[PDB]
Every structure is written in structure tokens, then in C-alpha cells.
Amino acid sequence: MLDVGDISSFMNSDSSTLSKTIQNSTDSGRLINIRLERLSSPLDDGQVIAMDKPDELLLTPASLLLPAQASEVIRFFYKGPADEKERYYRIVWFDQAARIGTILVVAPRQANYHFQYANGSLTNTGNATLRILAYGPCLKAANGKECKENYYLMPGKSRRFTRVDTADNKGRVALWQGDKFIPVK
């Protein structure tokens, strides 16, 4: 396949622009087209919805010839409202030596980051998605000597960790509020 970088990218509230590097690691050059769709949500039961205006989210370049064993920067620009709402977009990449879909999250310009860790459950009690993670011993020793989990936690949703043993005092929880890393436990 083609290397697009992160499968979900985050434009945090102090930022309206973002770059992704794409690498073509094969002998062939490639004809890439790139397209954007807003989404009701980033989840599987989400659906494409309309941008309020066609300059809400723009990228360059939308077409390029990427030669063999070479990389290029694609830039993304947000010009929609600066409000308390988080927005979700799909980046659709067409590849010719494959149609791959990745996620862009525009965190609310008016961010209110909050969370609760109670009874082993993380709950997002703010208005912007959190990137949550645990690391430490495994719950089922069938899974091995070290365990980690990584998830996106949308506003209002909860998550228990199911691989890492967070009840053991060597099990750790932390999360990202935009660009700030917060040691939860």
C-alpha cells in the first residue's frame, strides 16, 4: 500500500493548518488524487454530511505524481467556524502505481478539555476528543510480558481498558488534551 502517515490526524484548537508527509516506498512512481468529505462522526456508524462552505477544509496538492522512493508534503487548511463544535473529515486518497480513507479531526476552536477517571473507567466530560492510553502488565498473561492500549475517546463517551491491567499498581493511564500530555494514573 501507500504510506499516508497517521490514520487519524488532529488539528488542535490553537491551529488551523496541518501537514502530512506521504512516502512512496516502491520502485514505481504513483498518480495520487486526494479528496475531502465531512463526516457526522469518525465512527463506523457515521455518515458524510455537507461542509457549510466549500472552503471549510481545503488541501494542497490535490493531485500529484509521486515518483519512486520519494516523499511529499500535503497541507490542510480549516476555514470553518471558530466555535465549541468538533468537526470530522475523511481524507480520501486515490493511488495508481487503491482507494484509502483516513481521518482528520478539527478540535473545537473554543476547546473545553475535561475528563473523569473513576472505577477504572475514563470518561470524556469536555467538548473535544481525547487520545487515551494505558501501558503496563497484561491482564491475560496469554497476551505476553507487556501491554498497551490506545483509543480516541469522543465527548461524552467512556472507556475501560481491557488488555492492560490498570488495577495493578504498575498499570498506567494517561491521555492527550490536544498537545498537552496528561499523566492520569
Residue numbers in the entry: 0 to 96, 115 to 202
Quote the original article:
The major class of these adhesive pili (or fimbriae) is assembled via the classical, alternative and archaic chaperone-usher (CU) pathways. The biogenesis of CU fibres requires a periplasmic chaperone and outer membrane assembly platform termed the usher. Here, we report atomic-resolution insight into the structure and biogenesis of Acinetobacter baumannii Csu and Escherichia coli ECP pili assembled via the archaic and alternative pathways, respectively, whilst also highlighting some important deviations from the classical assembly mechanism. The non-classical chaperones, unlike their classical counterparts, maintain subunits in a substantially unfolded state by utilising a register-shifted DSC and a distinct subunit C-terminal carboxylate anchor.
ECP is composed of the EcpA and EcpD subunits, which are assembled using two periplasmic chaperones, EcpB and EcpE, and the EcpC usher. We next crystallized free EcpB and determined its structure using I-SIRAS phasing to 2.4 Å resolution. EcpB consists of the two characteristic Ig-like domains as seen in all other chaperones and has an overall boomerang-like shape. As expected, the superposition revealed that EcpB is structurally more related to CsuC (Z-score = 14.2) than classical chaperones (e.g. Caf1M, Z-score = 12.0). No topological differences were found in D1 between EcpB and CsuC, but both possess an additional strand D1 that is absent in the classical chaperones. Whereas the β-sheet packing in D2 in subunit-bound CsuC is almost orthogonal, in EcpB, the two β-sheets pack nearly parallel to each other, at an angle of just 15–30°. Domain 2 of EcpB does not possess helix 1, common in classical chaperones, or helices 1 and 2, characteristic for archaic chaperones. Instead, it has a short helix located in a long loop between β-strands C2 and D2. The C2-D2 loop is flanked with a pair of conserved cysteines (170 and 179), which form a disulphide bond that is not seen in classical chaperones. In contrast, the domain orientation in subunit-free conformations can be varied significantly, as seen in the structure of EcpB, which implies that a substantial rearrangement in the relative domain orientation occurs during the formation of the chaperone-subunit complex.
